[PDB]
Design a protein around this ligand. Structure first.
Ligand SMILES: *[C@@H]1O[C@H](CO)[C@@H](O[C@@H]2O[C@H](CO)[C@@H](O[C@@H]3O[C@H](CO)[C@@H](O)[C@H](O)[C@@H]3O)[C@H](O)[C@H]2NC(C)=O)[C@H](O)[C@H]1NC(C)=O
Lengths: 218, 218
């Protein structure tokens, strides 16, 4: 058994998207397909369900009219169409196999990520950061390399070939205004910082950008 | 729509310590067949939910026996005898008795340990930020526990709260300690006007707020 979902999608506000969940390894037509919405913040919300065998469908009151379900028996795929996309529709959508009053949602899809925004594929704007001029130097000093003005996710910030695997704190990305931004901090001895060389490896696969810029010691 | 409530919203428990989550229903979810359809799902970070228990007590095939559920009417609980590291995540309720079927609020399960003092830091903006026509001030609060953390900026003794960026990192694994990366952005005309910029931090480990300031006039 396996449920395969479409890839990540990016759409502008007011548009519509069509996610697909393909089920293989079982009687597709005889199992309900549950659609679950998970906003990045928190919470699992059930959009509704469809039984591919028949045309029956149910919708949670919150999503009635927003989402429409369709199923294709020939190719074992079930579709959901979201209308009038907005900012709050940006979330991760899952598809699950359910049989009411019997076998529960034992199998789930990988989860499709949908982001609604009018932005474009802006490359990163990494701004390496160094300790301030007015700051004391102690035994254990933490580094910092800022990244901002990039879109869409994800950007893999790391160190030179895993130079410092431990002591790394990659904070989650955030929308400052319309673009995503993040930060990182790695703890290193002050003795080895002048000698040891470490570089924040910012990456942006969406823009096919791989830029490496180290923070020169101050 | 049967409403399901979960308490506590957070359940810090140390390794090997029994944990108990409680679930309440807006109305009795009992069914005529002699069974009440309640299921428990665990969703680790960055993964799809996994079924744990269905029909109150029945355990899904392939789950450790430490998990166990029970209840009746509008009261249900989930018990973990001995908690381990892979048991970290959010536990969701789910009623499959009355259409439509709703999810629980969710109970973020975390591990508790000895309180760790915060590691505060502050970094000024960079030159390229000056060239672009703006200012980026960042304050780092690393490895603090528990979540009893508050951040406040007192610019030249005046408290600034507008345009405050807030970023917290989920519980770690190597040390299992939280971190924050709250920052703020300013404009050059507004960045060269105020003389003193400050970033305080309120934490349980030190009742007196921790002060971290840097003067614009320098
Ligand atoms: C539709 O009607 C059938 C037949 O009346 C129901 O089947 C019966 O369901 C009960 C409750 O699940 C079963 O009892 C349970 O059986 C399991 C497995 O043996 C056992 O571990 C439990 O302790 C409990 O005794 C019963 O065996 C089963 N009988 C048959 C012949 O299937 C079915 O539940 C009804 N479905 C609905 C939605 O009402």
């Amino acid at each position: 058994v396996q449920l395969q979902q479409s890839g990540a999608e990016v759409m502008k506000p007011g548009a519509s998207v069509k996610i697909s969940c393909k089920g293989t390894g079982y009687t597709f037509s005889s199992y309900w397909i549950e659609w679950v919405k998970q906003r990045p913040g928190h919470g699992l919300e059930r959009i509704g369900e469809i039984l591919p065998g028949s045309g029956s469908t149910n919708y949670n009151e919150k999503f009635r009219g927003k989402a429409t379900f369709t199923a294709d028996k020939s190719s074992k795929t079930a579709y959901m169409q979201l209308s009038s996309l907005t900012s709050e529709d940006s979330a991760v959508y899952y598809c699950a196999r359910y049989l009411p009053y019997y076998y529960a949602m034992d199998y789930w899809g990988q989860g499709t990520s949908v982001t609604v925004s009018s932005a474009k594929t802006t490359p990163p704007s990494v701004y390496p950061l160094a300790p301030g001029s007015a700051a004391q130097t102690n035994s254990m000093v933490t580094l910092g390399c800022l990244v901002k003005g990039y879109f869409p996710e994800p950007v893999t910030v790391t160190w030179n070939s895993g130079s410092l695997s431990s002591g790394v704190h990659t904070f989650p990305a955030v929308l400052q205004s319309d673009l995503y931004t993040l930060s990182s901090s790695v703890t290193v001895p002050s003795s080895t910082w002048p000698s040891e060389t470490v570089t924040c490896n910012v990456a942006h696969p969406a823009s096919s950008t791989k830029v490496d810029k180290k923070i020169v010691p101050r | 729509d049967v409403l399901m409530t979960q308490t506590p919203l957070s359940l810090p428990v140390s390794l090997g310590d029994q944990a108990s989550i409680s679930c309440r229903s807006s109305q009795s979810i009992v069914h005529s067949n002699g069974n009440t359809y309640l299921e428990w799902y665990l969703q680790k970070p960055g993964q799809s939910p996994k079924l744990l228990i269905y029909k109150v007590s029945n355990r899904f095939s392939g789950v450790p026996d430490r998990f166990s559920g029970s209840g009746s009417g509008t009261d249900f609980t989930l018990k973990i005898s001995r908690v381990e590291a892979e048991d970290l995540g959010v536990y969701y309720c789910f009623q499959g008795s009355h259409v439509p079927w709703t999810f629980g609020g969710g109970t973020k399960l975390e591990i508790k340990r000895a309180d760790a003092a915060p590691t505060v830091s502050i970094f000024p903006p960079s030159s390229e930020q000056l060239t672009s026509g703006g200012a980026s001030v960042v304050c780092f609060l690393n490895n603090f526990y528990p979540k009893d953390i508050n951040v406040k900026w007192k610019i030249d003794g005046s408290e600034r709260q507008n345009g405050v960026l807030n970023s917290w990192t989920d519980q770690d694994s190597k040390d299992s300690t939280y971190s924050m990366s709250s920052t703020l952005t300013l404009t050059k005309d507004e960045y060269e006007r105020h003389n003193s910029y400050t970033c305080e931090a309120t934490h349980k480990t030190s009742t007196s707020p921790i002060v971290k300031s840097f003067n614009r006039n320098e």
